[PDB]
């Protein structure tokens, strides 16, 4: 009790009963489980991003506005079906729906566009259709590529080459779908930006009863590497026809979040199903409950112990900031980022505090949805003459936007992460600020 | 040998952190141990045939559930007769005979405040037909359990009562319910309609953790392989759900419509068997055993003291099994609560105890039918030899394996106090 | 080569047993000695020439035992210590602040005695930094010492000496109102059974470490060195184990006050302390200290834990902190970082007093204030870095953690920065 | 059942702590030790401690092993010292409460490029006079131990060789020396002159840790209570040194000049006894047992498997003792390696094994001299009851207490494989 007594007196007992905080303070994993409480309500914003596949059930601008409101963060275009003309219209409709909320900069939500490739088929590597589809992706400014049937490091090098010199900023998420991809996982992860556990094909390529082992291992290795991992396929399958999911489906979504997935996905549930918006709402509801049930006490200790020593100041600042956020139960960590990297390094330590990422890059704002707990804020104001004033204005934008979006209140403590000079790669400062 | 240490997720078992444990899980590391989590299959039109019941026993069914929400007493008496005929068709080979428990699942209170009149009549039918277990529907408080116990009468004192937690009140009054029950069922069907669907996993994980702390059986139930009612293969969420219920700590997993009315009852049992075996090997025993030991209170009961010593000894030598003699099942239950990797082979003369111990994870019951030897120590040795010979035939044991043998100092229940390290010859 | 020094193989061990098995007599210490040495001043160590050698040997705090000697005798001891200290001020690098501590005679058969009231008044008038209060039995004893120091002695640190059964039993209430504790083993070993003193020592050190308050281990640590040039095997073991237990300071009494080898006794404590500090099992220690320290909304407390976590992540050579009272350095010290805590301060008294906290290396800044406050902060940080390089704490390519505040005055530390040296 | 008073004694609040920091914070000077002193005391015999009357007082004060320093004195002088020790020990044979075996250890003069001529002759004298242990001076490599072993002739292969590590080479070649030795002595006198004085604590803690990991006895020696050669009370550093050697994990602690030539030999023994008892209660068994368990490799040796099961069982019930039957002392040594809080009462027919087991922390030997029963199980039961009755007489046991009993399945050394939980009647 002494470790939380003064803060319980200051913040109140009501604060410490919410968001599974009694289970979070437990000394063992067994006690953590025993203290999980269905009456302990989640308070934090939902941190695991939702990827929704766009199809006939979710293609209209009106339907896409409801999906964005329900929680969709990434729109997936499955290039296994449909023409380039069909996908270009889907992209235009997503952008029209997203930009319909841009009139209010303090609330606008960026939505990433991901292109999922058809795959190699019977071939040994990059197919001719994939080369044409990847060129379409670059020409239409997609943010992410979900590369199908990645079996080795040379497969991701071929995808990177097909994106050309103009597609250097596109994130490549390698889909692991067969035995070879699982066995060569380390070499694939090393050259990829992240991984997708593509359970549909994986469950037919390897015994169905072994898929959970591959999922848990790949999520663990991605968490260790600090790279995004997506759990995909049949998560809420019965909602293609029914308005409510099965008990196994809610369990599956909760367990993917507890395992450590940065993103969760919907395929037929949103592409062709009867209830696309309800499927997004269900993933949102479960993910929020599961995030609060994470046992941060052991998780943070293990992430620190396993993460190798680092001389990179962004990495050093990130661990200091996450430690500081846990010490004061900070509502948020506000970070300035150009590429998203400083926010990704905070996310890898799995803070309970929201990572509010302020950026001028529209593409980085879309791409950071791949990292658990990163909430992108697109800053549109022109630069101040004095760089230090421009930094301060962006920090104040994060604080004000946070206070006007549900994140912060007067008296809260916030951790602020910034750098010593302009340009990417120089994050080195952590500050503790009291919200006024 | 190096081959031994590559199987049953042993590289992941030796990891220093849970994160490293996850990183070392290997799809090529094959399970070797017998499947420890019992399978409960609900009986119905798809699984009432005596021939179909034989295939379900072979597939891995350990407990047959009779759902009294449907069907008359005459229907349920025929289901019981059919199950017993199928089970006893294998009695001619005592070394491979598999006991199968019969569980009666009550209709419930309905709109009433407590034990309904139909439940009183159904519980009396259960006692008259010798059922082993009662799955009591909609248990909301300790007095509900007392009412079930009273309705079983003086002849049903040995029947196990597993309380079904199906609503908010049952979750909130969980501790008082568990204290007077033999175990719990996380009845997710009704629970998922009584409380928000997105909160069921919290109730499941909490109840399994509390049952594991108490050393009492816990069952995970409903929609685990739902799509297999009409499809030959389950969804990715369904295999994940079964694996995660085992990893959470469930002693039993259940099939309802999948075996009672579906077109793939045998395949649904085979699928639960396959997933449970993989998940049991992926349990992180290093932290689990440390936490169970630390949370279990100090005890002056010799059965409890012997049980923790035997589990510790089994881990030290990678014992293939812990062979235990038991009259009521209690000595096997106390070994099971520490979650040994070694199979707990329980030798008993009680047909009812042999059926009931399927409620405890990792207990493999063997029904001993031979009349007693005149010298008690020789009778004890003959039962231990029966455990060994049954284990060899079934694949649990081989020549050269080490086993831990748990027995007592006098006949009768309650006197377990001896642990012995034995080499299989 | 880096990973073979300072017991780093033993530091990376997964269990305390493996940590012990990996301790290596060939693994040389590299870090600066963190546990301060308190030397009692007497006839063997009173001359200016002897005091210069004691400062060079490692003495950080000079103890004046008011159980013997007149006020005139102690005033001369103080003047000699200050003269020896300022003789190195010509070349600040060898300049090291030395605290002056007054150890009271005690209550005797009486609370606060009349002689103690007069001696505490003398302490305030002569600007002593610390009071070692004898025979503290309860919180009201500390309040009486505080009252006797008056309004001019508010800044003096009170270290309560626990010397009997009552002091041990009422430890929590005494620690709550004290700045720190001294395990006064001489009287403790006669007041309670001799075989129980180690229990009282280990308990008091553990509770002081939990509270983040300084604790001193004292008496008969190197006793045989009063007449012999080398200590016994039990004496070297005792010094090493006091450091391993968690003592912030170790002390010499007769060994330096009247013995034949005062300088050698200081050199021996320095040598043992450096070896013992490298043998600390930081892997479990940091985890336990980090878990036990309560959650806090105080920005200095929040910044301190963030800075120590950052230092461990990059094997930082030092944490440079700006401090007025020493508090920001004390909050970093409580987490027992392997990185040296280099404390830059303008307060000469704070520079002397921070020797009470393990691993705090004070640097006295004496330059005029810059017109722009941000530039004055930058100049002090640069002074910490350049002094760190000159003194051997830092080298090109090292990473340092820098801890500062958002406005002038004590209590506003809230910033941690990661900096690469040259 | 036990009472709140029981849980306030022997540092039990500090023993139940979840962290080492909380363990330290809970150490209490008012919590009195209750268990018998487990760390043996080795006293060096000389002019101050040679008379039969003085030796009787030293045995009463707690001396378990008598050390003969062959660096000084003739064979005739040492033979008379041995005769005086045996006469003093046998003067207590009339009382089963006061009788205690005392081991005799020969400490060699030392090396020269091989074993010295004087050491060959002194080792021969040791075999001829039936010494139990050799403390071999200046052991630098495994071949030095082989030379000592060869010098123990055809008759002294059962004598224990404790290698003294006294220089840099001995520390660097520690692993190869420990592998071939029965145990180690941290000989701090010479070690503190051969290596820098400020590094001796590192060598001590490393060697104690490695011996504890190997399950072999380790002795801490020299200048532990040095000032007591001329003063009636020790310094604060000296009491701290003795307490810290016990906390480090030393099986034995030693007195040299303090008992051989000092003015207070009996008081020095009394002081080591008093400090050792306090320090043993302050051991943090919770983390120590977990680490010893985790570091000890997996084993298929039934004696090793039984030992860890017995120690686990003893902790579960706060057992008053673990009674073990042993012929060579090995089964008692394997229980001792896991550092149980319970006393290990070792019943043996070997007078030599009874003296030698004083090298292992917490082993209390009982020499059994009854003629063997014709029925082996009756002979085993008689010895188990002999251990219980001796435990009652000595104050370890009372009616209602639980004890753990360790035996084997057949006669002869090497077959330990049984652990039983017994209630004292
Ligand atoms: O800290 S964690 O949340 N949990 C660590 C943890 C510790 C012990 C065990 S046990 O020994 O098998 C076990 C199981 C049930 C018992 O009743 C019990 O006593 C012990 C299982 C997990 C975490 C840590 C990680 O490093 C990580 O990568 C991910 C996660 C995690 C992964 C999966 C989740 O379902 C939730 C979180
Ligand atoms: O992390 S620590 O450095 N050491 C933690 C530690 C862990 C276990 C044990 S044990 O279970 O008794 C033990 C003893 C010997 C064995 O062979 C073995 O396997 C286990 C002893 C220490 C530390 C932690 C603290 O929180 C603290 O306040 C202080 C210290 C400490 C204090 C005194 C020291 O001698 C060194 C450090
Ligand atoms: O996360 P990234 O991509 O490294 O960006 C972090 C960068 O953002 C900043 O905080 C502000 O930089 P800009 O003013 O160029 O936007 C830098 O100081 C820091 O290097
Ligand atoms: O697990 P339970 O019901 O306590 O049964 C254990 C009992 O079984 C035995 O091993 C054998 O007893 P029986 O010969 O009566 O079958 C007893 O020694 C022991 O008390
Ligand atoms: O450790 P303390 O006593 O709180 O002092 C820390 C203070 O030192 C500073 O870094 C510098 O303050 P000054 O300019 O007044 O010396 C402040 O920003 C901070 O509040
Ligand atoms: O410790 P040791 O020397 O192996 O002796 C243990 C032996 O003692 C016994 O318990 C009793 O044997 P004995 O009857 O020959 O004395 C054996 O069963 C066991 O093998
Ligand atoms: O491609 C996919 O998403 C799959 O197979 O799951
Ligand atoms: O009753 C049940 O089995 C349920 O509701 O899950
Ligand atoms: O007063 C003291 O310093 C003592 O008793 O140790
Ligand atoms: O020989 C010894 O005992 C020593 O040197 O300490
Ligand atoms: K595709
Ligand atoms: K029912
Ligand atoms: K004094
Ligand atoms: K000698
Ligand atoms: Mg696919
Ligand atoms: Mg129901
Ligand atoms: Mg005193
Ligand atoms: Mg010597």
């Amino acid at each position: 009790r002494a470790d939380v007594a003064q803060l319980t007196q200051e913040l109140g007992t009501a604060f410490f009963q919410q968001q599974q905080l009694p289970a979070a303070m437990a000394d063992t994993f067994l006690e953590h489980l025993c203290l999980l409480d269905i009456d302990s309500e989640p308070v934090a914003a939902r941190s695991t991003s939702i990827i929704a596949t766009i199809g006939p059930a979710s293609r209209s601008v009106e339907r896409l506005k409801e999906m964005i409101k329900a929680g969709m963060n990434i729109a997936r275009l499955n290039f296994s079906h449909g023409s380039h003309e069909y996908h270009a219209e889907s992209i235009a409709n997503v952008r029209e729906a997203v930009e319909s909320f841009a009139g209010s900069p303090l609330s606008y939500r960026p939505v990433a566009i991901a292109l999922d490739t058809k795959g190699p088929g019977s071939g040994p590597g990059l197919s001719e259709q994939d080369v044409r589809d990847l060129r379409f992706g670059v020409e239409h400014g997609v943010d992410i590529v979900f590369a199908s049937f990645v079996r080795k490091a040379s497969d991701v090098a071929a995808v990177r080459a097909a994106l050309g010199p103009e597609g250097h900023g596109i994130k490549i998420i390698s889909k692991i779908e067969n035995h070879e991809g699982v066995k060569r996982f380390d070499e694939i992860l090393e050259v990829s930006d992240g991984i997708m556990v593509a359970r549909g094909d994986l469950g037919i390529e390897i015994p169905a009863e072994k898929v959970f082992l591959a999922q848990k291992m790949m999520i663990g290795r991605c968490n260790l590497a600090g790279k995004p991992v997506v759990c995909a396929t049949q998560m809420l399958e019965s909602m293609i026809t029914k308005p409510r999911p099965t008990r196994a489906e809610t369990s599956d979504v909760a367990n993917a979040v507890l395992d450590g997935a940065d993103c969760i996905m919907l395929s037929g549930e949103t592409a062709k199903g009867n209830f696309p918006v309800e499927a997004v709402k269900m993933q949102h509801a479960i993910a929020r409950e599961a995030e609060a049930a994470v046992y941060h006490r052991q998780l943070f200790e293990e992430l620190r112990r396993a993460a190798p020593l680092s001389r990179d100041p962004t990495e050093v600042t990130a661990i200091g900031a996450v430690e500081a956020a846990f010490k004061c139960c900070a509502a948020a960590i506000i970070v300035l980022t150009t590429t998203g990297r400083s926010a990704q390094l905070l996310s890898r330590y799995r803070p309970r505090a929201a990572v509010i990422a302020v950026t001028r890059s529209a593409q980085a704002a879309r791409q950071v949805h791949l990292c658990r707990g990163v909430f992108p804020l697109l800053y549109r104001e022109p630069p101040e003459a004095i760089w230090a004033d421009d930094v301060d204005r962006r920090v104040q934008f994060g604080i004000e936007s946070g206070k006007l979006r549900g994140f912060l209140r007067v008296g809260d403590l916030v951790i602020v992460v910034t750098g010593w000079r302009p340009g990417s790669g120089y994050t080195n400062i952590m500050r503790v600020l009291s919200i006024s």
Side-chain angles (χ1 to χ4, degrees), chain A:
Chain A
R1 192 224 244 115
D3 59 331
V4 303
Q6 186 167 339
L7 206 57
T8 304
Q9 180 174 291
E10 296 172 354
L11 301 187
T13 63
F15 175 90
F16 282 100
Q17 97 80 37
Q18 300 177 311
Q19 56 182 323
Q20 309 295 347
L21 287 179
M25 313 299 183
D27 302 316
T28 63
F29 188 66
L30 178 55
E31 180 190 16
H32 162 79
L33 293 172
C34 296
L35 293 174
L36 292 170
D37 185 354
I38 61 165
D39 291 342
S40 186
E41 301 298 349
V43 170
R46 193 242 318 148
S47 64
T48 305
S49 288
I50 291 164
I51 301 161
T53 301
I54 307 307
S58 49
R59 216 166 159 256
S60 78
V61 170
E62 315 92 89
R63 177 66 45 90
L64 284 160
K65 289 171 183 176
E66 294 168 329
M67 299 257 292
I68 290 165
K69 276 153 45 178
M72 176 186 64
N73 307 112
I74 303 177
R76 172 181 176 253
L77 311 172
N78 185 4
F79 273 61
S80 290
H81 320 293
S83 68
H84 283 192
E85 187 169 39
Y86 183 89
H87 295 302
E89 189 177 8
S90 291
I91 292 172
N93 289 1
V94 167
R95 295 174 170 159
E96 183 181 331
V98 170
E99 298 312 303
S100 76
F101 304 98
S104 185
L106 237 71
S107 63
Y108 166 84
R109 287 160 295 207
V111 170
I113 293 180
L115 189 154
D116 188 307
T117 68
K118 185 162 181 171
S122 189
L126 203 63
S127 73
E128 295 175 316
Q129 188 171 345
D130 282 8
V131 171
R132 291 185 297 265
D133 298 345
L134 291 165
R135 285 177 179 155
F136 171 100
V138 177
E139 290 171 0
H140 291 261
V142 305
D143 304 291
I144 304 162
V145 164
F146 292 147
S148 294
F149 267 89
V150 172
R151 300 175 279 225
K152 57 194 91 186
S154 67
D155 285 347
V156 358
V159 169
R160 178 100 284 162
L163 294 173
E166 302 303 309
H168 56 283
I170 297 174
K171 301 289 181 174
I172 300 174
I173 302 300
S174 292
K175 298 168 60 179
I176 304 297
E177 318 208 52
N178 68 359
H179 189 267
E180 192 179 0
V182 175
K183 291 288 114 188
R184 297 166 77 86
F185 182 83
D186 291 347
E187 80 173 60
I188 294 166
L189 179 59
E190 182 78 21
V191 298
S192 304
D193 294 300
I195 293 290
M196 178 193 299
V197 180
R199 304 186 309 176
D201 277 302
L202 194 58
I204 291 164
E205 294 285 336
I206 77 174
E209 70 269 23
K210 291 179 183 291
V211 177
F212 80 96
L213 296 163
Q215 173 180 326
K216 291 167 183 283
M217 176 278 284
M218 294 191 272
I219 293 172
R221 293 195 196 168
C222 288
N223 287 178
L224 175 64
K227 285 185 165 170
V229 60
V230 179
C231 183
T233 311
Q234 295 191 324
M235 306 197 76
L236 293 181
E237 193 77 347
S238 76
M239 292 183 71
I240 287 171
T241 72
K242 289 178 180 234
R244 307 296 292 170
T246 74
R247 308 307 179 270
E249 287 163 358
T250 66
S251 166
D252 182 55
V253 173
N255 279 300
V257 173
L258 293 173
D259 286 345
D262 291 89
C263 303
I264 53 180
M265 196 165 105
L266 293 166
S267 297
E269 304 99 315
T270 60
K272 263 251 81 143
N274 287 337
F275 300 99
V277 177
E278 293 85 358
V280 172
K281 287 178 173 179
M282 180 56 65
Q283 278 198 336
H284 169 80
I286 303 163
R288 264 241 292 182
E289 293 283 359
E291 286 149 15
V294 167
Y295 186 37
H296 290 99
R297 178 173 288 208
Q298 182 166 340
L299 176 61
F300 185 54
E301 288 181 6
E302 294 191 350
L303 290 171
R304 289 153 53 213
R305 224 243 246 188
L309 303 172
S310 179
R311 322 223 309 137
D312 174 48
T314 306
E315 191 88 57
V316 176
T317 304
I319 197 172
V322 171
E323 175 77 72
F326 277 122
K327 182 66 157 183
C328 63
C329 297
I333 299 166
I334 296 171
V335 60
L336 265 50
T337 185
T338 299
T339 66
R341 186 161 164 274
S342 301
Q344 180 171 354
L345 299 185
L346 284 161
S347 174
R348 81 177 296 177
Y349 291 107
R350 295 289 191 251
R352 181 173 296 267
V355 174
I356 294 172
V358 181
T359 189
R360 279 194 172 93
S361 174
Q363 185 154 80
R366 294 187 290 268
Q367 293 171 337
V368 296
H369 282 306
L370 285 166
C371 303
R372 182 192 285 182
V374 183
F375 299 96
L377 301 186
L378 182 59
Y379 190 76
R380 308 161 191 267
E381 300 291 308
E384 291 284 306
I386 301 169
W387 183 71
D389 292 348
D390 195 62
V391 166
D392 287 345
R393 274 198 73 185
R394 281 177 281 163
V395 171
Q396 287 301 318
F397 172 77
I399 294 171
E400 290 304 312
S401 299
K403 284 167 69 189
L404 256 278
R405 273 215 205 170
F407 294 94
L408 308 169
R409 228 196 67 125
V410 168
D412 276 342
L413 278 184
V414 77
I415 304 303
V416 180
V417 175
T418 59
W420 61 275
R421 59 147 289 177
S424 179
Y426 304 107
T427 291
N428 77 320
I429 307 161
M430 188 272 292
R431 287 183 286 142
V432 181
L433 299 186
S434 187
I435 302 301
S436 65

